């Protein structure tokens, strides 16, 4: 199912699937469709999303096996408030460590831009404001620049992902063995 909250075969993840998910959110000024393909060799178990800005009405997909991708979404808080969708998703991996993913889709593009990041944290660590600060300010996040970026994560893993630049945002990440 190309529906937020679903887990799909990981080879099925791509821009078309995420655009469907994004569109299905409707007319909201700032929104995101997130897809993350687990090709890490270990099962992932959802912990939480820390929403610095915005909300989601989707259950964070609980179990994501190797060879599956998760689909997710978020959107700005409702009403005229001039805020975006910003947060960190945290999954526990079966080795006892944490996969964290930052997204930032800001309201005001005169000052801010789209960013994303991926990091592995040692141990089981829920997403929170400190994790957000680290990933957004200190751990060299990638711009949502309509381009692909790759980086090693340690722990025998690497990441490759893409985010666009606008307020109707797609974030596609693949986690693979190094
Ligand atoms: C990410 N940020 C909070 C530093 C700026 C953009 O967030 P927002 O105020 O538009 O929600
Ligand atoms: C994300 N960053 C803090 C590394 C660079 C600043 O980007 P922004 O908050 O001005 O968009």
Author numbering: 2 to 179
From the paper:
Fragaceatoxin C (FraC)11 is a potent haemolysin of the family of actinoporins, defined as a group of ~20 kDa protein toxins produced by sea anemones. Actinoporins are classified as α-helical PFT (α-PFT) because the transmembrane pore is predicted to form an α-helical barrel. The lytic activity of actinoporins on biological membranes is enhanced by the lipid sphingomyelin (SM) and by lipid-phase coexistence. Here we reveal structures of FraC corresponding to four different stages of its activation route, namely the water-soluble form, the lipid-bound form, an assembly intermediate and the transmembrane pore.
The crystal structure of a dimeric form of FraC in two crystal forms at 1.57 and 1.60 Å resolution sheds light on the initial events leading to the assembly of the pore. These two high-resolution crystal structures are virtually identical to each other. Suitable crystals were obtained in the presence of POC (a compound that mimics the lipid headgroup of DOPC and SM) and the detergent dodecyl-β-maltoside (DDM). Two molecules of POC are bound to each protein chain, occupying identical positions to those of the headgroups of lipids L2 and L3 in the crystal structure of both, the transmembrane pore and the DHPC-bound monomer. The protein–protein dimerization surface and the non-covalent interactions observed in the dimer resemble those between residues of the β-core region in the transmembrane pore (rmsd=0.4±0.04 Å). The structure of the dimer reveals a localized and notable conformational change with respect to the monomer (water soluble) at residues 14–17 of the N-terminal region. In the monomeric form of FraC, the side chain of Phe16 is inserted in a hydrophobic cavity of the β-core region. In contrast, during dimerization the residue Val60 of a second protein chain displaces Phe16 from its original position, leading to (i) partial unfolding and increase strain in the peptide bond of Phe16 and its neighbouring residue Leu14, (ii) a displacement of 4.7±0.1 Å of the Cα of Phe16 towards the solvent and (iii) further structural adjustments of Gly15 and Asp17. Because the N-terminal region is glued to the β-core region, partly by interactions between apolar residues, the rearrangement of two large hydrophobic residues (Leu14 and Phe16) may facilitate the detachment of the N-terminal region towards the membrane, a necessary condition to generate the active pore. Second, the serendipitous capture of a dimeric form of FraC exhibiting a similar protein–protein interaction interface to that of the pore, suggests a mechanism initiating the self-assembly and metamorphosis of FraC.
